[PDB]
Every structure is written in structure tokens, then in C-alpha cells.
Amino acid sequence: LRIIWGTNVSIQECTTNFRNFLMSFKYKFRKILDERDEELYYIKQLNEMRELGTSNLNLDARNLLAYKQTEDLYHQLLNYPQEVISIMDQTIKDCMVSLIVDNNLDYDLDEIETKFYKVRPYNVGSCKGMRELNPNDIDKLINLKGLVLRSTPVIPDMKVAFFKCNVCDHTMAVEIDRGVIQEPARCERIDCNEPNSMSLIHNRCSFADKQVIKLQETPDFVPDGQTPHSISLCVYDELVDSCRAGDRIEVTGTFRSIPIRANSRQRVLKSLYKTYVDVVHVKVSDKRLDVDTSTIEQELMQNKVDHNEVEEVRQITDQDLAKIREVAAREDLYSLLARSIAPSIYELEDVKKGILLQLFGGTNKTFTKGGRYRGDINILLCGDPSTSKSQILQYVHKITPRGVYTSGKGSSAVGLTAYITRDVDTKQLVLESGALVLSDGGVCCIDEFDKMSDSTRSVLHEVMEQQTISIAKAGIITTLNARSSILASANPIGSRYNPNLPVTENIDLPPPLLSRFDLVYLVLDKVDEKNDRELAKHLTNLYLEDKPEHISQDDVLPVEFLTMYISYAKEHIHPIITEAAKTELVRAYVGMRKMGDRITATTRQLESMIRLAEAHAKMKLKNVVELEDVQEAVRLIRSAIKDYAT
Amino acid sequence: SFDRPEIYSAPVLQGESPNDDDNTEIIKSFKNFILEFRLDSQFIYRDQLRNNILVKNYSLTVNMEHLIGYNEDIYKKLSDEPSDIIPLFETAITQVAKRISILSRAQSANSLPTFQLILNSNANQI
Amino acid sequence: VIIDLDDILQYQNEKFLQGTQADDLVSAIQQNANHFTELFCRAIDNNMPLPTKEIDYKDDVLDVILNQRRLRNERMLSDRTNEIRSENLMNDALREVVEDETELFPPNLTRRYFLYFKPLSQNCARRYRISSKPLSVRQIKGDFLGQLITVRGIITRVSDVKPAVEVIAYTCDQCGYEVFQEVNSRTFTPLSECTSEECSQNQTKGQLFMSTRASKFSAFQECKIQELSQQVPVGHIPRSLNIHVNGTLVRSLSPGDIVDVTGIFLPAPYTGFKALKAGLLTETYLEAQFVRQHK
Amino acid sequence: VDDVTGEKVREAFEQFLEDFSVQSTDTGEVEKVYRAQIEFMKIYDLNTIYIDYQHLSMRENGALAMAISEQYYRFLPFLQKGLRRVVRKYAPERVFQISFFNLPTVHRIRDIRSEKIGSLLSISGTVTRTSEVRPELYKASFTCDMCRAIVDNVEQSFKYTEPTFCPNPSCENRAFWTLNVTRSRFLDWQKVRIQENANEIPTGSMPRTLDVILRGDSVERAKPGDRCKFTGVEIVVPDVTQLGLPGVKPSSTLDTRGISKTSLGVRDLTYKISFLACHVISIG
């Protein structure tokens, strides 16, 4: 039997056995999933590849596990990427040919048979992270996680060369395929002699696209005592401009290792090789955390249509959409959704409710010239410590798609933008994005808001007000936007809050800046006895029977309905706040202005009430607001106002 | 303060072999000429060689009309550029001479120089 | 493979009491200790219980490469004795004929393992009466270069693990050979047209380019030992001394510990500024062999 | 064939600008109007022409429009030669620049890829850190001292030195220069360096530079702190400092399977996209 020299594969068994895979697939992945649509996938997805004209079929790996046979081809694939991927390409093309001979008059048969089809696999295991990898395991497939720092520009690559002479003149050309390009010394015209000069015109030849993206990961189950780490990867043609600066990406690719020169002068290729990744498939969306917006995305909605790519937005299916319109008919949604956010922390349903309303933030209205009104709302919450302020911030840090978590006294005025530095691998001056440009669209978090400087906290007078940032130093003189929803916290002098003391006095802020924040909570403690029984019964309810059961009685909690509920509530709704409520709204604002002769009330309360109000109208799927429900949009400030009497 | 590295090889894969009748794989015809010849009814060159090893003569004699007799193209190849094809025949002889030397010496009784061919014809007295 | 230095000594007392006299070997290891890895390892390779289990399908890639090298080596060695034996004209002579007209993969490359010594206790040296007296970094005079010593101190600045090359494997594309090259130094250089016995002695030399699934790699990691700060004189400062680590022993040196590294002590060529050299200053390090932690 | 292609487009171009160019009636904008541009150039002697793209988009039903727009860098000397023969027909030392304008679709810096090499494209951005004005040779008079040294020659393309063949008289290949610093024809060029627009960048990353070269007419027309529109031709500049990127980067080891025996002048190559422009309009 035939074999390849580096491996143990054969072209016949892989080809015919994989052809035998693509004709029968009946949810054996559910037979592992234990069952808790009977037509197979790849006829349907091959038709979706067929009529729409898009290339780039993609399959999983667990699907290759579940079917028996071809339990073998998986272990062939995970070891030997390049050859096996080439084989699956060839049999996909012949499967398209074997489909088209059913009706015989299909799509001008030559070119759609001529066009390159390719395979992108993913989900190929995750056992041990980047650190453990021995040099035994050079060429395999690897999954990673973590974010993305910067993005190099575009650099071409020769795929075709092009030659001329001065005699007299003939114009042969040559390809690459292996590592080097040979050029002839003689001849053309005459061929034979004379051995004329052979020039290279480097404005006529073909090229390619090669982009380098630098990455930093978070490999869970750490090899203690590990510190974070940085890898550099080298994406190719189609996947150029498929990664911004800030996303959370899960990557597949082939680990490689190529030596580097010494000092650009000799041929002394230094030993002790350098490693990188050589990506294949990029996985941006996810099913557990939140989904990105649409008013931000619209430039790359305007792009990416000429050239077929990946989805970037969670695909809303059709069957559960009926369940969305069913759960929307529930009356108790306003306490059910706010009850189902953080099922391990149990108080402060006005605060849970405001954190729910930060996820539904405002209506994005753009004017003709100027304007540019976002849906930003901004929340402080303070009070006594030992009140689980941190649990909320870690949970919101998990849910948010593009969240960045700084702290107090670990900041600087440099430390939030323009880290203009010296990159080592290319040895030039490359500019980095700081801590708010990565926060662009989403939720930031700041702890210990008391203990900033004067220079820091003078950043936020621009971000909170103008919704811009204006860098002006020696690199770049150009303003750049950072829309963000800032959440923060502070601990008083006490640390216990004492009564008969001014509320503005007990937190060391200038009360205009305290007056600039939208929704200010003041969570204090009660000396009474009746709640604490239910408190300890919740804790020992959690510790018992060593299994996550935490809240099942007497409550229904959606696990991941709410993320697609929020995203579907974020695209397909535009709420408008027309005439009939302006009487009550202006009436209550002038009623708020009545107090005069501690904290006061400015126009930020009015801007606050319209944006929080229409944020409540974004919930429960209503394109207009009503005169009713504005009252509790006032009461969200009035609950803190009853918490301001003491 | 280490020592020097080394370079070696191993034949694994074949191979761009038309074969184009170039500097090697002409020598295949002479390893096929000394060993694999027999005129009727007795092979003549092999016995002369295994005779000449014991007396230590280190030579060989060739008839040239015999070379145009057996093959044909290497004859005019030899008469084109003789100053570059004769040392190929010398190496062609000494690769066989090592084998006959070790099989004869070790059954049952370093170093050995390069041989010489001494040919002679009677075609045309110019 | 852990070849200790206790079984050798017990073997010498046993053979000393049986009769006859046994040649002194333990001190011969302790004096030189660099030749004996290669000598010892080509003593292993004559005898090995080969076929004891058939290959798994899902095993590895290094196994299947060494399996194809071994099998091709056998068939190449049997082909020539299938040719010359049919050209006649006890059989040890024909074996000596075939074994010297055939180029083979040398046994330095089909190995799969490593080999590590282990020093002797004070317990075994006390029972029968040096190779491991726990020294300090001030104590290492420049007259121990080559022996097998033992230090102790606190590890600081242990670096990452990255592959370093040992032999590099090219392909020739026309002749079909596989031209290897060994690298001993820090920096190497790639090579050109060919060095075989077929693309040489021809007019048209081929051109060669490398490949990475046929070379031989090894993990590599270096760190530093600082002085323990209890074994210092009255007015001094802790020194330091480098360590290279190769092979299986990697990922056992955590920073901020108290360790007992035992290894052999070689030179590695360098001097600093060019105007300070007098020839042939050498700048030592410490190879690692076996790591024993306190705590 | 290919010379029949480029010569075919050349005669179609001569046929284009010789004919009618104004469709309008007496209420105009009267005929022709190209010959008024040649003769109006003849009265003032300034040696350039500004021709539009839309009129060439009218006539051929887009066939010749899809023949200059792709391989523009291949079609300089044929176009400039045919226009020179039109000038020697209708007019009495000449350096001609053929600067197109008024293109349909404007791209940004992010839409730059490397499949769009050679072509024309409208780039809009922001000028920052212009440079000064310095000459450039492009007209050699360089031959060997034994004996003749009067050969006008190459280095229109950037090499720079030297002349290779037909040497000297009589010192043959590869005897060449000494050059000549008094027998040439120069022009002047500067190198402004555009920076991407503030109202375009994808949220959220940083602005991105690009280089751009201006020759001939469009010197000094740029302005530090103003927007611009440029002209497309988009050349490739040889770059050095991208080593250890990682690769794998190609190399150019020359062939030796020709010459029969009885050194290693191999090279590296790594290239970055620059831009070359000739018309600068300051609308913004």
C-alpha cells in the first residue's frame, strides 16, 4: 500500500472514507449529548453554499468523533493538518461535481466548477494551554483565548515573478511554489546567446496579503505560579481586517517555528528558534456572553459584503423567536429579568434593576449636522463595605462584550491612552491604544473612585461630558471617540455611614462631579433581625450538597435566553417618546427644581430621565413610550431620595 | 572550546531519473561491462582481473574494437573527448576491485590505489 | 534513564569479595564524566528487548518517524547482500563487505531517550568507608572543570522554554538524499548545492532546502543560582553561576526556592570586551543532571 | 500581440482626442475643446494637460475605460508617445504629464489591498509633516572614459546607476559610469505624508499613516492641515527593516542549471506599499 514519507496516511482510504462521511449524518453528536431535522447537514449547507454563491464551508470536529466509522480520520487530522486539509478540499470539489449531474443545466458549469472551495475546521480540543507545549508537538492544531492588542499594516507577498531584458524584448515569468525564486541568466531573443542582462520589473507581478496581529491570552487552569504572556500570529488573505483592537477571540491554527537572522548583515541564522501561530479559523461571536451592537458596526456592515466572511453577529434562529414573543407576554418581566441577573447576591433590586437598565442604554439618534446623541447612562454605587460590591463588578465584567477593568492608584494620565512605545520585533515606533479606547462601546469599571489624583479624574470631565478624547502630543494630533458606560464605586471615610451628617460630606468628591453622575446609590445596613435568617439560609443553601443548584425554588431562571433577548432588544427596536408624556415629564422636572433655599438637581437629571425612560421603553418591545411607566422611571431616583433622609 | 561538526547523507527517495545519460549512470554500463560480459564461450576480463590482483600488477588491458562490438554510443562518446571520460573508467574499475579484493583476501587467507587501463587496437595505421 | 552511582559501587564490593579484582570505575566516572554518556549509551544499544508490544495507532509522531527510519535501514541493508551474493565469486567476510559499502542512518539519531546520572549519598559512602560534598559558589575553584559536583543556593530568574536545534535535515530534490548537519555552536550557517555522492561528481549540482518534521529538537531553559547567604564570609556579597538545563528535567526549577543541583561543570567560549582579552579565557557554566529540593 | 495591444490602445487614444470632445450646442462650452487646451497651452508655454475621465467614460462604451484603469503603469510611454505625435502634428524640450481627474468612487486607506496594484484610485485624507523640494535625475549621460562618454540613456526607473549593454565604446560589459553632473534634465519632487481622516476610523483603533510622492506640476500645492484628493497609480517601494517579522519571506537565488562547470550573489526582497500622485485638488 502507498504511504507518505513523514506520515501514515493514504489518499484512497481518506478520500473514499470521507466521501462516505459526507453522505450520512443523523445527529450522533446528540447521541453523545444524550438527547434531552432528521435530514443531514451537508446537503442543506451545501445548498446554502450553492445558491448564495459564498465559498468557505466549515465543520466541527466532534462531528467527526461521533460518527463511526472515521473515528480514525480525526486523529489523522489533529496531527497532520496540511495534507489532510488538501485532501478534503479535493473531495469537496468532486462532491460538487457529483451533485451537478442531477439536473445538467446549472450555473454555467465551467466557472463554478473552476472556483476554489476550501475547508475551515474548528473546535479541535482544548486540553493544555500555551505554556505546557513541548517541542515534540510542533505541527498540530491549537486553541487559544484572550484579547488582541494592536494590528500591523498590510504587507504583500510575491506569488508570481516577472522578467524582461533589454534585448529585444521577451518577457518570460516564473512562480514560487517552494521557498525560493530562481531566475535565468540567459536567454530570450535570441535564446541562444548573447547572455544579456536580465532585469526584474517589480510593478507588474502578482501579490498577496499578509497581516500580523499581536495577541495576549488568559489560559485558565494556570500552571502556578504563572504570569501573563504574549504570542504573535500572522493571519492571511481573506481574514485580513477580521480583527479589531479589543475583541475576545478563540483561534485555531498551526504552531510553527522558523529561525531568524542575526543583525541583517550576514547569513548567520541564529539557533534557538522563534515560535508563532499560523491561523485558520476565527471564532468572533459567542453564545454565553453578550452580543455586539449595530450602530458601532455600520462601517464594517458597509464593508464585508463584497467579500464573503464570518458572521460577527449571533444568528437568531426562528423557533425560539416564538418563545421570545411568548416570554414578552409575561406580566412580571420587570422583576423576573431583574431577579434573574445575579442569582447569588440578594438585596438591592433597584440596583440590579439599574444594572439591567445599563444594558438597554438609551436611543441612538443622529442629527443632520452635529448632535450625535448616544444612550450612555452612568452609575455610581457606594456605601459601607462588606456589601458585595466586588461580586457585581466581576459578574458585569464577565457579561460585557468589551469590558476593561482598571483600579484606583494604578492609573496615570498616560495610562488611559497613547502608549507610544518601541516594538521589539520590527524595531520602530508603534502606537498602542490605552485603557479607554479598548473600552469603546460597552462597560468600564473603576474601583476606589475616592483615591484618584487631580490629573487622573480630569480625564473623565471629557469622557462624561463631550463624549470625545482629544490626544494632542507628538505622535498624533487627532481627536478620537470612546463611547463607554462608566460604572464605579467608592468607600467612605467612616467606613460606616453615620446619620445626622451630610451625604455630600461623607464621600470626598466635589459635588458638581458627584452631581454629574446619573444614578447614585447609597446602600446602607439595617440593624433589624428578620432579614438575616433568610440571609444565612441562602448561604448555607449554597454551601450544601456540593452542586450548583442555587436558586430553583420558587423561581424560574433563564440561563441564556436573556443574552439573545437583550441583543434582539438592542437591534430591532427604535423607541420614540412623543407628545403625551411631556406634560408629566416637564411637570416633574419643575417639581424637582422647587427644592432650594447637600445635593441639587440640574439638567443632567432631565437628560437622565428621558434616556432612562426610553431605556425602560426599549424593554417589553414597544416602539413608542407611554404616559404610564414614566412614574417608576422617576421612582428609580426617588428610591435613593428616600435613602437620603436618615 | 568544542570540536567540529560533521556532514553526511542517506538515500531515501527516488528520484528524477529519466535518466539523461550524464556523468554518473554511464558508470553503470561499465560495471555492466566488466562483470556482465561473456564472449563465446568464456568471460575474459573478470579472470584477468582476479589473476592480476594476486601478482600485484594493478592494471587492465582493453580491446577497443571489442567496445564498438558490444555497445555503440560510448565508442564515439570516447572518441569525441577522451581526456574526460577515461578517469570515469578508472573509478569504474576500482569500485569492482575493492569487492574482488576483500572477497578473495578474507576467504580464505586497506590500502589499494587507483588502477590504470592500457588499451590497444589495430584499426587504422595513420 | 537514571543510572545511579550506588549500584556500581555495590557491584564493586561484591566483585571484590567474590574474586577476581574489579577495575576501579567509580572514580573513573567522577574524574571525567563527559565521555561516559556516549560510551555508556553505545553500550546500551547493543541489546534491547524490541518487539514487546505492537504500535498503537494514536501514539505519537516521533515514534512513527523512528519506526520508518529503522525499517528502511533494514531493507537497505538487505538489498546489497541480495545483489552481491548472486555474483559469485564463513560468511562473516561477506558481512564485512556489505557493511562498508552502504551509507546508513547512524545510531546517534535513532535514539528516543535521554540519559542522566545520579550522585552518591553520604550514607553509602559511610557504610563502606566525596562525589557529593555540598559546595558553595565561593568554593568552586577553577580546578574542578570536568568533574561531577554539587551546589546549593536560591534560584532566581528562571526563563521560558523554547526549542533549540540539534541536527538539521535538508532534502536534495534531484538526487533524493537527505543531507544532515550537526550544530555545536551558538550560531550556525545554512549550506548550498549538495554534498552527497551523486549530486557530487556531476556537472549539474542540485539545490537543497530544509524541512522541520525530520530534524531533532530538544527543550532548553537557563536560570541562575545565587549564594545561600548563610555560607558567606563576614564582609561579602552573594555571587552567581549559570545553569543550562536540557531534556526531561525541564519545568522543575521554580523561582525562589532552596535546591541541591548536581551536575558536571564545562567551559563555553567567550570573553568580554575585545581589548581585555589575553587568550584563551573561557567563562564557565554548570550543566544539570539531577535536581533535589529541600522543602 | 501585446505590442499590438498597447499600440492598439495607443491609436485608439490618438483617435480619441483628435475627434470631437464637446457634445453641447451653441449655448456652451463650444467645440472642440481639446485643441483649445493645446493652443491655449501654446500661448503660455507651461507643458501639461488636464484631461477628464468622464468624457472617456462616454465614448467607447467602457471598453477602453477598462484598459487604462487596470494596467496604468504599463501604459505610460505609449500614451505619452501618441500624444507627442499629436503635438508634432498641430504645434511646433517637452516633458508631458497626463493627469486624470474626476473619478467615480473614492476609497479610504483601509480599502487598500494588494490586488489593486497598478490601478487608479481616489485617496482622500489629511496632510501632515510635508518635506522640502529636491531634484532627481531620470536622464542619464553616463558612459566609460575609454573612450566615448556621450550616451543618453536609462534610469528613468529607479536603480539608479548604471548603463549596462552596448558598452562602452569600446570597454564592453559591464564597464559603465562615471556619470555627468552637468548634462541631464532634472525635475523636482517632494514627499508629503498623509494621515487618515478623523471621521472614518473603525471604532476603536488608532490612525494610520501612508506615504505619497508628488512630481512635476503638483509640487507645493499641498497644505499642512488640510484635506486633499489624489491620483491613483500606487507604486511599490523597496523596504529593509521588516526582517524577523516572522516570514517566510522569499529569496532570489539565481539559476545554475545552465552554465557547465570545469558566487552566492543571492538577494532578499521585502516591499511596502507607497503611493504616487500627480494631481492635487484641495477641496475639503
mmCIF file of N, CA and C in Angstrom, chain A residues 337-398:
data_model
loop_
_atom_site.group_PDB
_atom_site.id
_atom_site.type_symbol
_atom_site.label_atom_id
_atom_site.label_comp_id
_atom_site.label_asym_id
_atom_site.label_seq_id
_atom_site.Cartn_x
_atom_site.Cartn_y
_atom_site.Cartn_z
ATOM 1 N N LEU A 337 -36.774 39.495 35.118
ATOM 2 C CA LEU A 337 -35.471 39.702 34.497
ATOM 3 C C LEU A 337 -34.479 40.316 35.470
ATOM 4 N N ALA A 338 -34.905 41.316 36.240
ATOM 5 C CA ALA A 338 -34.018 41.896 37.241
ATOM 6 C C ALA A 338 -33.738 40.939 38.389
ATOM 7 N N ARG A 339 -34.626 39.976 38.632
ATOM 8 C CA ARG A 339 -34.353 38.957 39.635
ATOM 9 C C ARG A 339 -33.375 37.912 39.114
ATOM 10 N N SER A 340 -33.347 37.690 37.804
ATOM 11 C CA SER A 340 -32.554 36.615 37.227
ATOM 12 C C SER A 340 -31.167 37.043 36.774
ATOM 13 N N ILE A 341 -30.664 38.192 37.214
ATOM 14 C CA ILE A 341 -29.353 38.634 36.744
ATOM 15 C C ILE A 341 -28.239 37.957 37.525
ATOM 16 N N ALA A 342 -28.163 38.234 38.825
ATOM 17 C CA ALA A 342 -27.090 37.738 39.680
ATOM 18 C C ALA A 342 -27.737 36.862 40.739
ATOM 19 N N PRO A 343 -27.897 35.565 40.476
ATOM 20 C CA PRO A 343 -28.657 34.708 41.389
ATOM 21 C C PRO A 343 -27.909 34.302 42.647
ATOM 22 N N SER A 344 -26.745 34.878 42.920
ATOM 23 C CA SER A 344 -26.003 34.579 44.132
ATOM 24 C C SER A 344 -25.934 35.754 45.100
ATOM 25 N N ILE A 345 -26.477 36.912 44.733
ATOM 26 C CA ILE A 345 -26.456 38.109 45.568
ATOM 27 C C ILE A 345 -27.889 38.604 45.673
ATOM 28 N N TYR A 346 -28.322 38.947 46.887
ATOM 29 C CA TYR A 346 -29.758 39.021 47.164
ATOM 30 C C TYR A 346 -30.054 40.211 48.086
ATOM 31 N N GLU A 347 -30.228 41.369 47.466
ATOM 32 C CA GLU A 347 -30.721 42.626 48.032
ATOM 33 C C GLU A 347 -30.907 43.505 46.802
ATOM 34 N N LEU A 348 -31.160 44.801 47.001
ATOM 35 C CA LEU A 348 -30.785 45.887 46.075
ATOM 36 C C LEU A 348 -31.346 45.675 44.666
ATOM 37 N N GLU A 349 -32.625 45.296 44.602
ATOM 38 C CA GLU A 349 -33.286 45.057 43.323
ATOM 39 C C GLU A 349 -33.498 46.340 42.533
ATOM 40 N N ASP A 350 -33.446 47.495 43.193
ATOM 41 C CA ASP A 350 -33.301 48.743 42.460
ATOM 42 C C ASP A 350 -31.924 48.846 41.818
ATOM 43 N N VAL A 351 -30.894 48.309 42.468
ATOM 44 C CA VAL A 351 -29.554 48.369 41.898
ATOM 45 C C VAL A 351 -29.393 47.325 40.804
ATOM 46 N N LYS A 352 -29.905 46.113 41.043
ATOM 47 C CA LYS A 352 -29.981 45.103 39.992
ATOM 48 C C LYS A 352 -30.797 45.604 38.817
ATOM 49 N N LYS A 353 -31.838 46.372 39.109
ATOM 50 C CA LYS A 353 -32.697 46.900 38.070
ATOM 51 C C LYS A 353 -32.001 47.999 37.279
ATOM 52 N N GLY A 354 -31.190 48.823 37.943
ATOM 53 C CA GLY A 354 -30.421 49.818 37.216
ATOM 54 C C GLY A 354 -29.302 49.211 36.400
ATOM 55 N N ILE A 355 -28.731 48.110 36.881
ATOM 56 C CA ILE A 355 -27.711 47.410 36.116
ATOM 57 C C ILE A 355 -28.336 46.710 34.918
ATOM 58 N N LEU A 356 -29.590 46.278 35.049
ATOM 59 C CA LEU A 356 -30.325 45.827 33.876
ATOM 60 C C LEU A 356 -30.560 46.971 32.903
ATOM 61 N N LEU A 357 -30.904 48.151 33.413
ATOM 62 C CA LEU A 357 -31.133 49.278 32.519
ATOM 63 C C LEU A 357 -29.857 49.862 31.941
ATOM 64 N N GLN A 358 -28.682 49.490 32.442
ATOM 65 C CA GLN A 358 -27.474 49.916 31.751
ATOM 66 C C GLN A 358 -27.236 49.073 30.507
ATOM 67 N N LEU A 359 -27.824 47.884 30.450
ATOM 68 C CA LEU A 359 -27.687 47.036 29.277
ATOM 69 C C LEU A 359 -28.674 47.386 28.173
ATOM 70 N N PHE A 360 -29.623 48.272 28.433
ATOM 71 C CA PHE A 360 -30.620 48.698 27.464
ATOM 72 C C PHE A 360 -30.464 50.173 27.137
ATOM 73 N N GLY A 361 -29.228 50.651 27.077
ATOM 74 C CA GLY A 361 -28.973 52.073 27.206
ATOM 75 C C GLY A 361 -29.403 52.989 26.077
ATOM 76 N N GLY A 362 -30.474 53.746 26.320
ATOM 77 C CA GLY A 362 -30.891 54.870 25.500
ATOM 78 C C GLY A 362 -31.242 54.597 24.054
ATOM 79 N N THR A 363 -31.541 55.654 23.309
ATOM 80 C CA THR A 363 -31.822 55.554 21.888
ATOM 81 C C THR A 363 -30.775 56.352 21.133
ATOM 82 N N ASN A 364 -30.177 55.734 20.129
ATOM 83 C CA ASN A 364 -29.115 56.367 19.370
ATOM 84 C C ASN A 364 -29.737 57.190 18.252
ATOM 85 N N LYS A 365 -29.802 58.501 18.454
ATOM 86 C CA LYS A 365 -30.309 59.436 17.463
ATOM 87 C C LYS A 365 -29.146 60.238 16.910
ATOM 88 N N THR A 366 -29.060 60.309 15.590
ATOM 89 C CA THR A 366 -28.055 61.105 14.905
ATOM 90 C C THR A 366 -28.764 62.207 14.143
ATOM 91 N N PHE A 367 -28.243 63.418 14.229
ATOM 92 C CA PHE A 367 -28.883 64.533 13.558
ATOM 93 C C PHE A 367 -28.307 64.685 12.157
ATOM 94 N N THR A 368 -28.671 65.777 11.490
ATOM 95 C CA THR A 368 -28.076 66.078 10.197
ATOM 96 C C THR A 368 -26.633 66.535 10.369
ATOM 97 N N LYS A 369 -26.428 67.632 11.092
ATOM 98 C CA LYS A 369 -25.098 68.135 11.398
ATOM 99 C C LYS A 369 -24.991 68.381 12.894
ATOM 100 N N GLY A 370 -23.949 67.824 13.506
ATOM 101 C CA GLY A 370 -23.773 67.915 14.943
ATOM 102 C C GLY A 370 -24.563 66.861 15.689
ATOM 103 N N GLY A 371 -25.100 67.216 16.855
ATOM 104 C CA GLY A 371 -25.928 66.294 17.608
ATOM 105 C C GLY A 371 -25.164 65.125 18.190
ATOM 106 N N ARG A 372 -25.341 63.946 17.578
ATOM 107 C CA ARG A 372 -24.631 62.713 17.918
ATOM 108 C C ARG A 372 -24.902 62.329 19.377
ATOM 109 N N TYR A 373 -26.147 61.952 19.609
ATOM 110 C CA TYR A 373 -26.617 61.665 20.954
ATOM 111 C C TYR A 373 -26.594 60.163 21.172
ATOM 112 N N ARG A 374 -25.819 59.731 22.155
ATOM 113 C CA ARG A 374 -25.682 58.319 22.465
ATOM 114 C C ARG A 374 -26.797 57.878 23.409
ATOM 115 N N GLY A 375 -26.622 56.700 24.004
ATOM 116 C CA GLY A 375 -27.529 56.179 25.008
ATOM 117 C C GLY A 375 -26.795 55.821 26.282
ATOM 118 N N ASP A 376 -25.714 56.544 26.535
ATOM 119 C CA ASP A 376 -24.907 56.347 27.729
ATOM 120 C C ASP A 376 -25.690 56.713 28.982
ATOM 121 N N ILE A 377 -25.699 55.813 29.964
ATOM 122 C CA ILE A 377 -26.023 56.164 31.340
ATOM 123 C C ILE A 377 -24.866 55.709 32.219
ATOM 124 N N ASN A 378 -24.747 56.316 33.397
ATOM 125 C CA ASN A 378 -23.540 56.174 34.207
ATOM 126 C C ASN A 378 -23.895 56.069 35.681
ATOM 127 N N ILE A 379 -23.399 55.034 36.349
ATOM 128 C CA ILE A 379 -23.883 54.655 37.670
ATOM 129 C C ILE A 379 -22.728 54.673 38.653
ATOM 130 N N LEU A 380 -22.901 55.383 39.758
ATOM 131 C CA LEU A 380 -22.089 55.177 40.945
ATOM 132 C C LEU A 380 -22.891 54.369 41.945
ATOM 133 N N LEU A 381 -22.190 53.591 42.758
ATOM 134 C CA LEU A 381 -22.803 52.987 43.926
ATOM 135 C C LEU A 381 -21.764 52.954 45.030
ATOM 136 N N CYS A 382 -22.138 53.426 46.210
ATOM 137 C CA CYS A 382 -21.199 53.490 47.316
ATOM 138 C C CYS A 382 -21.884 52.940 48.551
ATOM 139 N N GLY A 383 -21.274 53.145 49.700
ATOM 140 C CA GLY A 383 -21.868 52.702 50.935
ATOM 141 C C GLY A 383 -20.861 51.941 51.748
ATOM 142 N N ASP A 384 -21.363 51.239 52.750
ATOM 143 C CA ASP A 384 -20.499 50.528 53.670
ATOM 144 C C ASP A 384 -19.836 49.352 52.959
ATOM 145 N N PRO A 385 -18.602 49.013 53.311
ATOM 146 C CA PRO A 385 -18.014 47.774 52.789
ATOM 147 C C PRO A 385 -18.622 46.534 53.428
ATOM 148 N N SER A 386 -18.140 45.360 53.001
ATOM 149 C CA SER A 386 -18.783 44.059 53.235
ATOM 150 C C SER A 386 -20.228 44.078 52.748
ATOM 151 N N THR A 387 -20.417 44.553 51.517
ATOM 152 C CA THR A 387 -21.751 44.649 50.940
ATOM 153 C C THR A 387 -21.773 44.018 49.545
ATOM 154 N N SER A 388 -20.733 43.239 49.219
ATOM 155 C CA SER A 388 -20.554 42.547 47.936
ATOM 156 C C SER A 388 -20.632 43.516 46.761
ATOM 157 N N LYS A 389 -19.851 44.590 46.850
ATOM 158 C CA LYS A 389 -19.692 45.471 45.704
ATOM 159 C C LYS A 389 -18.879 44.792 44.620
ATOM 160 N N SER A 390 -17.936 43.942 45.019
ATOM 161 C CA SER A 390 -16.997 43.376 44.063
ATOM 162 C C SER A 390 -17.636 42.281 43.227
ATOM 163 N N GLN A 391 -18.582 41.535 43.810
ATOM 164 C CA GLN A 391 -19.222 40.430 43.099
ATOM 165 C C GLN A 391 -19.997 40.929 41.894
ATOM 166 N N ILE A 392 -20.665 42.066 42.063
ATOM 167 C CA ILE A 392 -21.365 42.724 40.973
ATOM 168 C C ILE A 392 -20.395 43.117 39.873
ATOM 169 N N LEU A 393 -19.238 43.653 40.248
ATOM 170 C CA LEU A 393 -18.314 44.136 39.234
ATOM 171 C C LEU A 393 -17.634 42.999 38.499
ATOM 172 N N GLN A 394 -17.405 41.876 39.167
ATOM 173 C CA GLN A 394 -16.850 40.740 38.452
ATOM 174 C C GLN A 394 -17.882 40.117 37.529
ATOM 175 N N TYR A 395 -19.142 40.086 37.957
ATOM 176 C CA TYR A 395 -20.178 39.490 37.123
ATOM 177 C C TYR A 395 -20.442 40.325 35.873
ATOM 178 N N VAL A 396 -20.527 41.645 36.037
ATOM 179 C CA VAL A 396 -20.668 42.541 34.896
ATOM 180 C C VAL A 396 -19.426 42.496 34.015
ATOM 181 N N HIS A 397 -18.251 42.307 34.621
ATOM 182 C CA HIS A 397 -17.038 42.139 33.828
ATOM 183 C C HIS A 397 -17.055 40.846 33.023
ATOM 184 N N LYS A 398 -17.788 39.830 33.473
ATOM 185 C CA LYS A 398 -17.921 38.650 32.630
ATOM 186 C C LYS A 398 -18.920 38.859 31.502
#
